[PDB]
Design an enzyme around this catalytic site. Structure first.
Site, PDB file in Angstrom:
ATOM      1  CG  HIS A 140       4.367 102.289  81.885  1.00 28.16           C
ATOM      2  ND1 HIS A 140       3.827 103.548  81.753  1.00 28.16           N
ATOM      3  CD2 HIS A 140       4.651 101.869  80.632  1.00 28.16           C
ATOM      4  CE1 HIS A 140       3.801 103.885  80.478  1.00 28.16           C
ATOM      5  NE2 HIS A 140       4.292 102.878  79.774  1.00 28.16           N
TER       6      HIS A 140
ATOM      7  CG  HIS B  16       4.617  98.578  76.394  1.00 26.57           C
ATOM      8  ND1 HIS B  16       3.311  98.782  75.988  1.00 26.57           N
ATOM      9  CD2 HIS B  16       4.997  99.721  77.010  1.00 26.57           C
ATOM     10  CE1 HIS B  16       2.927  99.991  76.339  1.00 26.57           C
ATOM     11  NE2 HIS B  16       3.932 100.585  76.963  1.00 26.57           N
TER      12      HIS B  16
ATOM     13  CG  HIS C 208       0.494 104.727  77.482  1.00 26.76           C
ATOM     14  ND1 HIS C 208       0.145 103.528  78.061  1.00 26.76           N
ATOM     15  CD2 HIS C 208       1.798 104.617  77.132  1.00 26.76           C
ATOM     16  CE1 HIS C 208       1.195 102.726  78.068  1.00 26.76           C
ATOM     17  NE2 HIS C 208       2.206 103.360  77.510  1.00 26.76           N
TER      18      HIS C 208
ATOM     19  CD  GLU D 229       5.116 108.470  75.900  1.00 29.10           C
ATOM     20  OE1 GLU D 229       4.063 107.837  75.652  1.00 29.10           O
ATOM     21  OE2 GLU D 229       6.253 108.035  75.605  1.00 29.10           O
TER      22      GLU D 229
ATOM     23  CG  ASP E 112       7.404 102.642  78.306  1.00 28.32           C
ATOM     24  OD1 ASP E 112       6.386 101.928  78.291  1.00 28.32           O
ATOM     25  OD2 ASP E 112       7.532 103.637  77.570  1.00 28.32           O
ATOM     26  CG  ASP E 113       8.481 100.195  75.234  1.00 32.51           C
ATOM     27  OD1 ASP E 113       7.806  99.269  74.730  1.00 32.51           O
ATOM     28  OD2 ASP E 113       7.971 101.272  75.646  1.00 32.51           O
TER      29      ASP E 113
HETATM   30 ZN   LIG Z   1       4.371 102.784  77.444  1.00 32.64          ZN
END
Ligand SMILES: [Zn+2]
EC number: 3.5.4.2
Length: 313
Positions: A13, A15, A193, A196, A274-275
């Protein structure tokens, strides 16, 4: 930390656009002769404070402007791959958001060229296996997503799956069922996704409508016992992102996080950043936050890391 850092990991996961470090962003803006709204790196970093998913997205998308050339996308992906090398991530299955770039005029072939090139380097030089995942922007129409899938067909073999990110609430998985159906029909696996900020209902939709191989986030399944049992029973992977959830306020504190709880119940949860450029940490910083705030043991460490290996597509 070091011990956590030395664990063999898979990141599932992540980006690529979310690995855009403030430092890189500025240097890419310089190479592309772009005048930034931000005065300096430090002002950009200070702006990495979010009250929810949308505040982050708004800025996340604003950051994509500096990505314009194939070399930009190579630099971006190669910088992240080097992070993986340092943190012993031996396998990556990363998202990218083609629409964020194609909608700005950057050709599809150019985005892929840069990423693909980097991924080749990551594998032949770094020993890092990869499964590129093309993600659709869920706040845009299925129609636009269909057009994106048409662009990807000649390229289909570069992607192991299609994904689904962006503003979750009010854009349920059902909205994209046709395009996902087609991607599957064209040989794509699927992920998404779900749960969340979105209700457990969205997780069910992802499971049965979009027919995903794994759930991204999925933390709100903890509200739904019959779904918990389904997760536990089918061993469907969850790509949990600790620092992401904290920074986006999904949990008020890391000590509130339910990832270990889920692990101990038999949910095939994993750890991902994730980010990482936006949430102050890559995958190893995520494992660590777990240990510091939830007293995660080396036991559960080895277990989480092993799940990410198991959950590979
Ligand atoms: Zn994400």
């Amino acid at each position: 930390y070091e011990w956590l850092n030395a664990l063999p990991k898979a990141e599932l996961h992540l980006h690529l656009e979310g690995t855009l470090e403030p430092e890189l962003l500025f240097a890419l803006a310089e190479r592309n002769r772009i005048a930034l709204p931000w005065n300096d790196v430090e002002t950009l970093r200070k702006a990495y404070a979010f009250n929810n998913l949308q505040e982050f997205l708004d800025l996340y998308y604003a950051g994509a402007d500096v990505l314009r050339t194939e070399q930009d996308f190579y630099d971006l992906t190669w910088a992240y791959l080097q992070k993986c090398k340092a943190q012993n991530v031996v396998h990556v299955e990363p998202f990218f958001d083609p629409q964020t770039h194609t909608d700005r005029g950057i050709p599809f072939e150019v985005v892929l060229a840069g990423i693909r090139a980097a991924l080749r380097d990551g594998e032949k030089l770094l020993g890092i296996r990869h499964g590129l995942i093309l993600s659709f922007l869920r706040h845009l129409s299925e129609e636009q997503a269909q057009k994106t899938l048409d662009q990807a067909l000649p390229f289909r073999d570069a992607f192991i799956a299609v994904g689904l990110d962006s503003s979750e609430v009010g854009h349920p998985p059902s909205k994209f069922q046709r395009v996902f159906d087609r991607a599957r029909s064209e040989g794509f696996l699927t992920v998404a996704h779900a749960g969340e900020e979105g209700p457990p209902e969205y997780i069910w939709e992802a499971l049965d409508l979009l027919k995903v191989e794994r759930i991204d986030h999925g933390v709100r399944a903890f509200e739904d016992e019959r779904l918990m049992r389904r997760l536990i029973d089918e061993q469907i992977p969850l790509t949990v992102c600790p620092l992401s959830n904290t920074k986006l306020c999904v949990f008020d504190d890391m000590s509130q996080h339910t990832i270990l709880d889920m692990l101990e119940r038999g949910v095939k949860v994993t750890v991902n950043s994730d980010d990482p450029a936006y949430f102050g940490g890559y995958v190893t910083e995520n494992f660590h936050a777990l240990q510091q705030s939830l007293g995660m043991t080396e036991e559960q460490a080895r277990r989480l890391a092993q799940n990410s290996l198991d959950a590979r597509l």
